[PDB]
RNA sequence: GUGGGAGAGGGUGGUGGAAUUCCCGGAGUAGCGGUGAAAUGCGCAGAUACCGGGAGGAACGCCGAUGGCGAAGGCAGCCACCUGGUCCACCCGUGACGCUGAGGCGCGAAAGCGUGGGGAGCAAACCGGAUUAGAUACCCGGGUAGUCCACGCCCUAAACGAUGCGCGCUAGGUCUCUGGGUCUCCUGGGGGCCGAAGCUAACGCGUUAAGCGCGCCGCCUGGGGAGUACGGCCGCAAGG
């Protein structure tokens, strides 16, 4: 679901929050929490070299689970299922019976008090993992492992599924949510059942200041610049691009291929994405 | 040549008589109308939805080629 | 070279093309209505469909066939004297089978077949 | 479905002397029965329009009774539909 | 509890101890859902009028049952499962219709 | 109530194969395609035609019928679950509880709209080729909405049997679907045809009345202007 608010104030008109009701736990578990160190978009040189990055709320960064062979047929009960701020997914509490806790991103489907286990033997419920190689073809499937034990890179965010389509030797062939179609290798891990929260892409920021509450700062055109600053800079009144569209640094920003052709990951892409 | 008349007693529902069905279906696979299977309206209705699900089984065809 | 092989003509309302093959099922040689030197509507015809035929059993019987499988796909004019063609052709013709294409009620057809 | 041994039951909570199946008290108490699943399989199946006729039918119908019921024995009227819970 | 005929076919390329082993996940599955077996025949292979998976054999089972309505559909879900079970379909029972 | 029956009636969830398209491997050569005839188009950068592999979507061939079901719109592979109407036999229960229905409320083909998916085939708009005096068309090659799924809107129709619902009475022949019997045939309930009496301006209707009658409702009052305007209510808009 996603809550409306009524018009009272003229930017609450449009603005849709979240419905938050798989939440059952509304504090992070404090033996899995660390300070989130803010950037505000600058590196260690100290310069901005992701623009406009700044002045979002506090938060308290949550370690996730990204690997799960790394305790193999010991079961876990979902013991909660909480808002992460450094996500679009949700986040599930597991208790394990080993009595170690741990948090991984929250597939859709999860109850609050089920159990779930990894390994080569888990049966395909939601929740489980395994390596690739075991979950039947044409179950779909989220946090994909891209190299052995590398951890869990693909469908990570909210309502995102990826989904097996074949096999090839030691290799797996899936299509990732953008709709590539790729071979990975069929020990990486994967948990079966796609990730929650999909209603996420249909929430509406509403104003200004929710993109800012996000540490997200005003974006300005470049056609609103000068020369200086950049290739759309410039002209008297309104001015059409007068060139390619470019960003500040020039290239090409309206079509141009920028994948390095010779990339050894090449062998592994069968066909290039879609739409 | 009414097809029912060459046969003895037979069940319309049981589903895996493919040796008795398999003459209920043409010489290319289609089944036959009343006027050759000799059942009546109520029956071929019995009759045919079965044979769908027994090539659903594997065990009618669901077409064949035409020898001549 | 084979001795064995199959026909297939593709005989349709425009054309008759006939294509041998070998035993798994690889082309050896082709013909059709517009190989033999027709064009246009000509191409469709059952003299057409004939030299096609001819012509192509002339093709197969170069490389040393002897003995086809006729198939028969398509409802067309110069399908059943293509099908002749063979017969006379000096080939064998051990058996005709018709595997046209009939769906099960599938895809929507143009409007000149509504 | 309801089964035969769950429709018993009611016919035996509600008949007026010891044989009866069809006087206005079984009957109504019959129809509320299929009326609140009928209500509970729409809940779900939303999308089941036709089978909603059905209910606005029954509903029509057990409506006429207790109109029939509430004019010749009041006293009777409201002892049926309290043990049913029925008004609103 | 209705009665239902529970049909399904196998790979038919596997060796006698594997193929007990599904039967074995299939045994256990049709009692995990409150399955109760009545009459049971297993006709293994079978011409088959086309194809399944490539393969134009198939081994065949076959057990008339006793479980809960509302169960038959998950349980067939699970059925299919297997990498190796390649058709399920469960069919309520009911009498013979007999002509002649 | 008890006991049975037939059915594409409705909703959810699955799943089968035929075919079209695209992709991949093979093999193969000079054309393929299309029409009245053609051109556009596609094709030696290897097409068509053929064999194998794979991807995806939509619609269900034979059965299929002058058939079945639904109040209407409408509903067709198959499987399970959930659910509605309806007929039959027994003559067991209630005891006129009935009929109709201004408002109201719900349902309501296609197209259309909103947010999100999906997109194989088809195809408004649009492009190109032909035809032609012209061709903003008919014919051919392409092609986007849309056609499909979910939720929410719109509420119109040659939404037709151009025939409101219920009840009773007024010859029969025949064909068909579906229950029940004492299974020639008798009896119910639906679907067609021809016909008694009667009705009708005629055409035609005729136990499925458009006949003889009662009840209640909706509707008509010369053609156009006009389903328009104004007012009013509804809708995101289209527009009702
Ligand atoms: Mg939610
Ligand atoms: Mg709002
Ligand atoms: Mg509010
Ligand atoms: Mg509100
Ligand atoms: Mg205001
Ligand atoms: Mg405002
Ligand atoms: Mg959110
Ligand atoms: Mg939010
Ligand atoms: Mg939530
Ligand atoms: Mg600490
Ligand atoms: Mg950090
Ligand atoms: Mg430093
Ligand atoms: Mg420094
Ligand atoms: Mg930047
Ligand atoms: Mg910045
Ligand atoms: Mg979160
Ligand atoms: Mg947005
Ligand atoms: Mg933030
Ligand atoms: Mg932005
Ligand atoms: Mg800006
Ligand atoms: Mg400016
Ligand atoms: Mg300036
Ligand atoms: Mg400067
Ligand atoms: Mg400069
Ligand atoms: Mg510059
Ligand atoms: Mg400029
Ligand atoms: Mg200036
Ligand atoms: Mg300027
Ligand atoms: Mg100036
Ligand atoms: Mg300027
Ligand atoms: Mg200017
Ligand atoms: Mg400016
Ligand atoms: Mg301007
Ligand atoms: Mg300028
Ligand atoms: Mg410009
Ligand atoms: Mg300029
Ligand atoms: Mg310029
Ligand atoms: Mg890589
Ligand atoms: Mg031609
Ligand atoms: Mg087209
Ligand atoms: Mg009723
Ligand atoms: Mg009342
Ligand atoms: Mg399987
Ligand atoms: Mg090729
Ligand atoms: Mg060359
Ligand atoms: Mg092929
Ligand atoms: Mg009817
Ligand atoms: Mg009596
Ligand atoms: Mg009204
Ligand atoms: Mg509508
Ligand atoms: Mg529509
Ligand atoms: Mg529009
Ligand atoms: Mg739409
Ligand atoms: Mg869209
Ligand atoms: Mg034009
Ligand atoms: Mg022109
Ligand atoms: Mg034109
Ligand atoms: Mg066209
Ligand atoms: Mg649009
Ligand atoms: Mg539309
Ligand atoms: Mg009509
Ligand atoms: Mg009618
Ligand atoms: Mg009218
Ligand atoms: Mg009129
Ligand atoms: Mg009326
Ligand atoms: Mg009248
Ligand atoms: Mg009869
Ligand atoms: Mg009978
Ligand atoms: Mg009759
Ligand atoms: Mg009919
Ligand atoms: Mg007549
Ligand atoms: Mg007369
Ligand atoms: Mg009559
Ligand atoms: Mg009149
Ligand atoms: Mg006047
Ligand atoms: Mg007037
Ligand atoms: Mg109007
Ligand atoms: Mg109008
Ligand atoms: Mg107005």
Redesign the interface.
């Given at each position: 679901a996603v809550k409306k608010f009524k018009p009272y104030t003229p930017s609450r008109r449009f603005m849709t929050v979240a419905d938050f009701s798989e939440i059952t736990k509304t504090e992070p578990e404090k033996s899995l929490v660390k300070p989130l160190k803010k950037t505000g978009g600058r590196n260690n040189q100290g310069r901005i070299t992701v623009r406009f990055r700044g002045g979002g709320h506090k938060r308290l960064y949550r370690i996730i689970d990204f690997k799960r062979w790394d305790k193999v047929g010991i079961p876990a009960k979902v013991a909660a299922i909480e808002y992460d701020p450094n996500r679009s997914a949700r986040i599930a509490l597991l208790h394990y019976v080993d009595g170690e806790k741990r948090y991984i991103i929250a597939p859709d489907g999860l109850q609050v008090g089920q159990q779930v286990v990894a390994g080569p033997d888990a049966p395909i419920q939601v929740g489980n993992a395994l390596p690739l190689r075991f979950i039947p073809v044409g179950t779909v499937v989220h946090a994909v492992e891209l190299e052995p034990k590398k951890g869990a890179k693909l469908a990570r965010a909210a309502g995102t599924s990826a989904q097996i389509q074949g096999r090839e030797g030691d290799y797996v062939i899936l299509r990732l949510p953008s709709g590539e179609l790729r071979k990975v290798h069929g020990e990486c891990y994967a948990t079966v059942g796609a990730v929650g929260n999909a209603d996420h892409k249909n929430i509406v920021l509403g104003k200004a200041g929710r993109s800012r509450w996000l540490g997200r700062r005003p974006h300005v055109r470049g056609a609103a610049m000068n020369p200086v600053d950049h290739p759309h800079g410039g002209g008297e009144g309104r001015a059409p691009r007068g060139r390619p569209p470019a960003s500040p640094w020039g290239w090409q920003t309206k079509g141009l291929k920028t994948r390095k052709r010779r990339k050894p990951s090449s062998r592994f892409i069968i066909a290039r994405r879609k739409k | 040549a009414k097809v029912?008349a060459t046969?003895?007693?037979?069940?319309?529902?049981?589903?895996?008589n493919?040796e008795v069905l398999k003459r209920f279906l043409s010489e290319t696979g289609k089944i036959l109308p009343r006027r050759r299977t000799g059942?009546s309206a109520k029956?071929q209705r019995?009759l045919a939805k079965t044979i769908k699900?027994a090539?659903?089984?594997?065990?009618?065809?669901?077409?064949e080629?035409?020898?001549? | 070279q084979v001795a064995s092989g199959r026909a297939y003509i593709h005989a349709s309302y425009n054309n008759t093309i006939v294509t041998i093959t070998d035993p798994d099922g690889n082309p050896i040689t082709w013909s059709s209505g517009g190989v033999i030197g027709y064009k246009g509507s000509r191409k469709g015809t059952p003299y057409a469909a004939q030299l096609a035929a001819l012509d192509a059993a002339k093709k197969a019987m170069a490389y040393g066939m002897q003995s086809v499988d006729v198939i028969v796909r398509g409802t067309g004019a110069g399908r059943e004297q293509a099908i002749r063609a063979l017969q006379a052709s000096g080939l064998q013709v051990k058996?005709?089978?018709?595997?046209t294409p009939?769906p099960?009620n599938g895809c929507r057809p143009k409007k000149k077949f509504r | 479905p309801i089964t035969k041994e769950e429709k018993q039951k009611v016919i035996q909570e509600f008949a007026r002397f010891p044989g009866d199946t069809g006087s206005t008290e079984v009957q109504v108490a019959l129809l509320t029965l299929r009326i609140n699943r009928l209500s509970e399989h729409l809940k779900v199946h939303k999308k089941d329009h036709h089978s909603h006729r059905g209910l606005l039918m029954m509903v029509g119908q057990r409506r006429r009774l207790l109109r029939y019921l509430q004019r010749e024995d009041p006293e009777r009227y409201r002892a049926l539909i309290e043990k049913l819970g029925i008004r609103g | 509890m209705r009665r239902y005929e529970v049909?399904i076919?196998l790979n038919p390329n596997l060796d006698q101890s594997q193929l007990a082993l599904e039967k074995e996940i299939i045994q256990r599955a049709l009692e995990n859902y409150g399955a109760r077996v009545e009459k049971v025949e297993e006709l293994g292979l079978?011409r088959?009028?086309?194809p399944?998976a490539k393969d134009p054999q198939?081994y065949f089972l076959?057990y008339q049952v006793e479980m809960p309505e509302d169960r038959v559909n998950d349980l067939a879900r699970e059925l299919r499962i297997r990498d190796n079970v390649r058709?399920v379909?469960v069919?309520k029972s009911?009498?013979?219709?007999?002509?002649?």
């Open positions: - | 029912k046969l003895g007693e037979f069940d319309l529902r049981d589903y895996r493919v059942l029956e019995i699900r090539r659903i089984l594997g065990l009618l065809p669901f077409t080629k035409l020898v001549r | 058996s005709i089978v018709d595997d009939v099960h | - | 049909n076919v079978r088959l009028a086309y399944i198939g076959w058709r379909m069919v009911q009498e013979p219709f007999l002509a002649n």
